[PDB]
Design an enzyme around this catalytic site. Structure first.
Site, short mmCIF file in Angstrom:
data_model
loop_
_atom_site.label_atom_id
_atom_site.label_comp_id
_atom_site.label_asym_id
_atom_site.label_seq_id
_atom_site.Cartn_x
_atom_site.Cartn_y
_atom_site.Cartn_z
N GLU A 9 0.54 -1.39 0.25
CA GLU A 9 0.14 -0.02 0.09
C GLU A 9 1.06 1.05 0.23
O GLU A 9 1.91 1.15 0.78
CB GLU A 9 -1.10 -0.16 0.93
CG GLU A 9 -0.11 0.28 2.68
CD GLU A 9 -1.27 -0.51 4.37
OE1 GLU A 9 -1.76 -1.61 3.94
OE2 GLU A 9 -1.47 0.49 4.24
N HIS A 37 0.18 -6.37 11.91
CA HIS A 37 -0.43 -7.61 11.04
C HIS A 37 -0.53 -9.23 12.10
O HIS A 37 -0.18 -10.21 11.32
CB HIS A 37 -0.85 -7.86 9.78
CG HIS A 37 -1.42 -6.89 9.04
ND1 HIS A 37 -0.79 -6.68 7.86
CD2 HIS A 37 -1.73 -5.59 9.49
CE1 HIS A 37 -1.48 -5.83 7.22
NE2 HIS A 37 -1.75 -4.71 8.39
N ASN A 51 -4.19 -7.38 3.43
CA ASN A 51 -4.80 -6.81 5.27
C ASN A 51 -5.83 -7.70 5.70
O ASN A 51 -6.28 -7.73 4.94
CB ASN A 51 -5.22 -4.97 4.74
CG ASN A 51 -4.01 -4.06 4.49
OD1 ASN A 51 -3.38 -3.28 5.14
ND2 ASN A 51 -3.93 -4.26 3.13
C1 LIG Z 1 -1.75 0.62 12.97
C2 LIG Z 1 -2.34 -0.95 12.83
C3 LIG Z 1 -2.96 -0.54 11.59
C4 LIG Z 1 -3.32 -1.76 10.83
N1 LIG Z 1 -3.51 -1.12 9.78
C5 LIG Z 1 -4.93 -2.34 9.24
C6 LIG Z 1 -5.33 -1.98 7.68
O1 LIG Z 1 -5.82 -1.69 7.61
N2 LIG Z 1 -6.61 -2.93 7.43
C7 LIG Z 1 -6.12 -4.17 7.44
O2 LIG Z 1 -6.59 -5.29 7.52
N3 LIG Z 1 -5.97 -4.72 9.30
C8 LIG Z 1 -5.14 -4.00 10.01
N4 LIG Z 1 -4.29 -3.79 11.21
C9 LIG Z 1 -5.16 -5.49 11.36
C10 LIG Z 1 -6.31 -5.48 12.51
O3 LIG Z 1 -6.71 -4.44 13.18
C11 LIG Z 1 -5.53 -6.41 13.18
O4 LIG Z 1 -5.36 -7.70 12.14
C12 LIG Z 1 -7.25 -6.88 14.09
O5 LIG Z 1 -7.51 -5.90 14.34
C13 LIG Z 1 -6.88 -8.37 14.65
O6 LIG Z 1 -8.07 -8.78 14.49
P1 LIG Z 1 -8.79 -9.60 16.07
O7 LIG Z 1 -10.06 -9.88 16.47
O8 LIG Z 1 -8.00 -10.78 16.10
O9 LIG Z 1 -8.27 -9.14 17.49
P2 LIG Z 1 -7.53 -7.16 17.48
O10 LIG Z 1 -8.53 -6.56 17.00
O11 LIG Z 1 -6.17 -6.88 18.26
O12 LIG Z 1 -8.14 -7.47 19.77
C14 LIG Z 1 -8.14 -8.06 20.04
C15 LIG Z 1 -8.42 -7.38 21.52
O13 LIG Z 1 -8.36 -8.51 23.11
C16 LIG Z 1 -8.18 -7.44 23.60
N5 LIG Z 1 -7.08 -8.44 24.99
C17 LIG Z 1 -6.09 -9.04 24.62
N6 LIG Z 1 -5.60 -9.94 25.65
C18 LIG Z 1 -6.38 -9.73 26.29
C19 LIG Z 1 -6.75 -10.49 27.37
N7 LIG Z 1 -6.35 -10.65 28.17
N8 LIG Z 1 -8.16 -10.31 28.94
C20 LIG Z 1 -9.10 -8.50 28.13
N9 LIG Z 1 -9.22 -8.98 26.53
C21 LIG Z 1 -7.62 -8.79 26.00
C22 LIG Z 1 -7.35 -6.14 23.04
O14 LIG Z 1 -7.39 -5.09 24.40
C23 LIG Z 1 -7.82 -6.15 22.14
O15 LIG Z 1 -9.27 -5.10 22.60
C24 LIG Z 1 -3.88 -2.58 11.27
C25 LIG Z 1 -3.48 -2.94 12.82
C26 LIG Z 1 -3.05 -2.23 13.42
C27 LIG Z 1 -2.46 -1.90 15.22
C1 LIG Z 2 0.90 2.92 6.98
C2 LIG Z 2 0.09 3.17 8.21
C3 LIG Z 2 -0.39 1.98 9.10
C4 LIG Z 2 -0.96 0.77 8.36
C5 LIG Z 2 -2.29 1.68 8.09
O1 LIG Z 2 -3.70 0.44 8.18
C6 LIG Z 2 -1.96 3.34 7.82
C7 LIG Z 2 -1.22 3.71 8.28
C8 LIG Z 2 -1.47 5.29 7.85
C9 LIG Z 2 -0.21 6.12 8.55
C10 LIG Z 2 1.33 5.44 8.57
C11 LIG Z 2 1.28 4.73 9.34
C12 LIG Z 2 2.25 3.63 9.20
C13 LIG Z 2 2.82 4.30 10.41
C14 LIG Z 2 3.60 6.53 10.07
C15 LIG Z 2 4.44 6.35 8.28
C16 LIG Z 2 4.02 7.42 11.23
O2 LIG Z 2 4.72 6.48 11.48
C17 LIG Z 2 2.97 8.82 10.66
C18 LIG Z 2 1.94 8.18 9.85
C19 LIG Z 2 1.97 6.20 9.77
#
Ligand SMILES: Cc1cc2nc3c(=O)[nH]c(=O)nc-3n(C[C@H](O)[C@H](O)[C@H](O)COP(=O)(O)OP(=O)(O)OC[C@H]3O[C@@H](n4cnc5c(N)ncnc54)[C@H](O)[C@@H]3O)c2cc1C
Ligand SMILES: C[C@]12CC[C@H](O)CC1=CC[C@@H]1[C@@H]2CC[C@]2(C)C(=O)CC[C@@H]12
Length: 501
Positions: free
Chosen positions: A358, A442, A480
């Site tokens: 991306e 991820h 993703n």
């Molecule tokens: C900054 C960032 C950007 C991302 N961008 C994308 C994107 O654009 N598109 C995409 O497809 N994916 C993206 N992802 C990944 C996506 O968010 C994750 O794959 C997804 O949220 C995972 O879902 P899940 O249900 O497995 O767990 P999570 O969404 O991680 O949820 C787990 C939950 O369980 C809770 N938990 C943990 N341990 C415990 C415990 N012991 N007791 C109670 N609660 C607990 C946590 O606090 C959390 O709320 C990104 C992730 C991040 C962090």
């Molecule tokens: C790509 C990503 C992380 C992946 C998300 O889906 C979209 C996104 C937006 C802003 C980005 C971040 C990666 C980390 C970056 C580059 C920073 O440290 C500031 C802006 C941030």
């Protein structure tokens, strides 16, 4: 009210990200009173500044989970991203450090949906059929994937608006150079309301995606799970959400069901109480890392000793690699950049360099000429979680060197664009590193579908225990992940509710 020690509950869902939100929605619609236990807070109460979340330009204690400083992959780049000192607080983004990688995870009601970029991608059917051959792919493609996309509120950007708006100049520049090198680009669907974004650009509504917000939450625009699945689950009147409770132990109760031990924490992360509740059914949705750590600990400590030897195995990082390229002066990326990525370079079908990348924003508010990318590579490397007797902690065996195969795949694409454009990589975005290879957004795997569980997420040795989150996925889905996790959860819940309950 929240869970109290001594309580007995039909269904307990641990965690409130994608898998947990699907479980809660389907259980409550089936009429099963459901308790979600979430370690983070509910993000529905304004902070000091009157807003719920902090933006990326001036982060505060709301940014990080129990940390003394902010942590972003891009650090101290032209005024942007500098890690600042903050108060310890139950903030939204957890940067969980293991020995060879940090795993970014959302903490709070909605899990990762609170902090992610919203990119909602359905995996390629051919790859899907290969990595999860035990799953009926007709059902997935005719029913579960569409169900997930609709439930999540996926939408597509107005392509005409995309072409004209200054906010996506960075993406147009990234598209131009990818296409000049023969690479295919594609628009990527998102849960961010693109109609709202047009109003943002028009100055008519509060800016969020056009206001430097994403990874510490979006005050507007982004359809996080508390606005979709969890709102629908709460609408049934059968959902209870207990926040600020960390589940620490799950073990068979006497007579039937399972004892669930949890630590109640205050907003500074101090344990203020310990509770034990009994639940008939437990759905692990603590995420790839959270669920794996729990089950690996429970097995090793003799609480759930009969769990499969596969528990903890097959963890991957969805081949995440970040990199930045320098553009020449005529290929500016713009001083105004939307925080929501909309365009990808799809080279998955190339067996020599199978990547989906991306084009990511670097919203520094000035012209940097940087094209930034997050690449999902087909890295075959995997690791495992293992309980460490000395520390009482679960370790992840992933080594940073395991990212080398992914870097080699990414390099093949980016080196070609660099050759065509006569440009070099940036080496100042991440300690003079070119490749951002020490973190993943991820995390996937650890409790693999049809290996550690049965074909529907059941832990067969313990009737009533189910896994419904990213720990089920075999390390890499080539895109993703959240749409896949949601659809897989949709599939499993359908079968579990119809078969077990
Ligand atoms: C900054 C960032 C950007 C991302 N961008 C994308 C994107 O654009 N598109 C995409 O497809 N994916 C993206 N992802 C990944 C996506 O968010 C994750 O794959 C997804 O949220 C995972 O879902 P899940 O249900 O497995 O767990 P999570 O969404 O991680 O949820 C787990 C939950 O369980 C809770 N938990 C943990 N341990 C415990 C415990 N012991 N007791 C109670 N609660 C607990 C946590 O606090 C959390 O709320 C990104 C992730 C991040 C962090
Ligand atoms: C790509 C990503 C992380 C992946 C998300 O889906 C979209 C996104 C937006 C802003 C980005 C971040 C990666 C980390 C970056 C580059 C920073 O440290 C500031 C802006 C941030």
């Amino acid at each position: 009210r929240t869970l109290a020690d001594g309580d007995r509950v039909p269904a307990l869902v641990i965690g409130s990200g994608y898998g947990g939100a699907v479980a809660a929605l389907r259980l409550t619609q089936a009429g099963i009173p459901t308790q979600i236990v979430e370690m983070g807070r509910s993000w529905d109460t304004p902070g000091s500044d009157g807003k719920i979340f902090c933006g990326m330009l001036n982060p505060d204690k709301r940014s990080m989970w129990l940390a003394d400083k902010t942590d972003q992959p891009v650090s101290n780049f032209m005024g942007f991203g500098i890690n600042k000192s903050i108060d310890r607080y139950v903030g939204v983004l957890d940067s969980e450090r293991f020995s060879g990688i940090k795993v970014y995870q959302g903490r709070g009601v909605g899990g990762g949906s609170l902090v992610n970029g919203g990119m909602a991608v359905t995996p390629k059917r051919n790859y899907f059929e290969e990595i999860l051959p035990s799953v009926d792919s007709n059902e997935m493609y005719n029913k579960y994937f569409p169900r997930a996309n609709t439930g999540l509120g996926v939408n597509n950007i107005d392509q005409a608006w995309f072409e004209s708006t200054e906010w996506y100049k960075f993406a147009r520049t990234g598209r131009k150079t990818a296409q000049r090198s023969g690479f295919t680009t594609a628009f990527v669907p998102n849960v961010y309301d693109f109609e709202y974004m047009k109003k943002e650009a028009a100055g008519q509504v509060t800016k969020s995606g056009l206001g430097g917000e994403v990874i510490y939450g979006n005050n507007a625009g982004k359809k996080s799970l508390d606005k979709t699945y969890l709102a629908q689950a709460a609408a049934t009147g059968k959902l209870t959400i207990t926040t600020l409770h960390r589940v620490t132990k799950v073990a068979p109760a006497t007579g039937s069901g399972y004892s669930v031990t949890m630590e109640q924490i205050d907003e500074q992360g101090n344990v203020v109480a310990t509770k034990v509740v009994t639940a008939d059914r437990v759905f692990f949705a603590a995420g790839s890392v959270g669920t794996s750590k729990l089950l690996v600990s429970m097995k090793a400590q003799g609480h759930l000793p009969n769990l499969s030897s596969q528990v903890g195995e097959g963890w991957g990082n969805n081949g995440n690699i970040m990199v930045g390229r320098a553009n020449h002066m005529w290929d500016a990326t713009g001083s105004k950049q939307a925080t929501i990525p909309t365009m990808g370079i799809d080279n998955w079908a190339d067996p020599t360099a199978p990547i989906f990348a991306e084009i990511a924003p670097l919203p520094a508010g000035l012209e940097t000429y940087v094209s930034l990318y997050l690449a999902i590579t087909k890295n075959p490397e995997r690791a495992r979680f293992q309980f460490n007797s000395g520390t009482g902690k679960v370790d992840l065996t992933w080594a940073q060197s395991q990212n080398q195969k992914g870097i080699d795949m990414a390099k093949k694409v980016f080196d070609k664009i660099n050759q065509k454009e006569g440009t070099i990589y940036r080496t100042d975005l991440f300690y003079y590193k070119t490749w951002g290879d020490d973190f993943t957004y991820h995390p996937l795997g650890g409790v693999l579908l049809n290996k550690a569980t049965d074909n529907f997420g059941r832990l067969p040795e313990y009737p009533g225990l189910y896994v419904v989150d990213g720990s089920l996925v075999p390390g890499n889905v080539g895109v993703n992940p959240f749409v896949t996790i949601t659809a897989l959860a949709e599939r499993n819940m359908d079968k579990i509710i119809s078969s077990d309950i």
